[PDB]
Amino acid sequence: QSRALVIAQELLSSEKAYVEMLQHLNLDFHGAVMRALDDMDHEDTLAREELRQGLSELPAIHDLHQGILEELEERLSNWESQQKVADVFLAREQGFDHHATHILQFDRYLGLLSENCLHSPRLAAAVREFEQSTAKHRLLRVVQRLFQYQVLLTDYLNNLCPDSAEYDNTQGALSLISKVTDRANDSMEQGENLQKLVHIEHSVRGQGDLLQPGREFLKEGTLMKVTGKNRRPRHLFLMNDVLLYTYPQKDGKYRLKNTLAVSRPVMEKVPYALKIETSESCLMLSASSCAERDEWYGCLSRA
């Protein structure tokens, strides 16, 4: 009840920040690119028309979320009378279709954008002015909200009564969004990774925002920290970028213990041993098998 109240508050606060972001995207990215492309009409046409189609989704998304925010703001003001938010998503099936449409042409118009900047001073001038505050990276932030609703709405459902019209609606809103995010995973080269990083951020108590350009999730798994003769569990999130060193809690959630920037010793009391070394950090970890130890070795090696 308090737990579900704080999650709707978490949903509203993050929605405000998202609507503010979609606002400045439409003014500084869509607006500036529309202005440029309108000039280029009088300067090829194909690239512009495809850019215009993919860019048309941004105002439609902005309007969708402007509405979600207005309904969310009002519903949280009258929380001690009606304690319902899920149905706000259900009411907007047509709205989230713009998300699906955006996802479907995402890589096409964004690839077409950087490509067309290499020989279009006007388009380059528009994109630079925006990149001021990489565009394709700055637009993953649009599609990322969808994975956030999934994580938030799942935390919202776990605190609802399994026999509520709201538990039902939350499930419906979850399947409605999953219909949309399915397209991200199968139509975007960065969709599967964007999802991994959204779920990994939300699970780790200590890791804020993993969305970094070029960052890609590689391996997860628990290993034992060898402190003398004592063996304590540590859950590892290995990226090409950074190495998250955590502790698995009873919650299914974790705790960021240290972070590392991406040897196999022989010792009796520590069989299946892994020694990860950097100039700032060193970990003495034990695997359960010499195959588990060599699975991680080859993966930590590859990057």
Swiss-Prot record:
Gene Ontology CC: one annotated term: cytoskeleton
Supply one GO BP term: actin cytoskeleton organization
Domain DH, which positions?
3-187
Q: Does the keyword Magnesium apply?
A: no
Quote the gene name from the UniProt entry.
Answer: FGD5
Which stretch of the full sequence is covered here?
Answer: 890 to 1205 of 1462
Specify the protein name: FYVE, RhoGEF and PH domain-containing protein 5
Protein's job: Activates CDC42, a member of the Ras-like family of Rho- and Rac proteins, by exchanging bound GDP for free GTP. Mediates VEGF-induced CDC42 activation. May regulate proangiogenic action of VEGF in vascular endothelial cells, including network formation, directional movement and proliferation. May play a role in regulating the actin cytoskeleton and cell shape.
Report the locations given in the UniProt record: Cytoplasm, Cytoskeleton; Cell projection, Ruffle membrane; Endoplasmic reticulum; Golgi apparatus
The answer to whether UniProt assigns keyword Zinc to this entry is yes
This entry's Gene Ontology molecular function terms read: guanyl-nucleotide exchange factor activity; small GTPase binding; zinc ion binding
Organism annotation: Homo sapiens
Q: Which domain of life is it from?
A: Eukaryota
Q: In which tissues is it expressed?
A: Expressed in endothelial cells (at protein level).
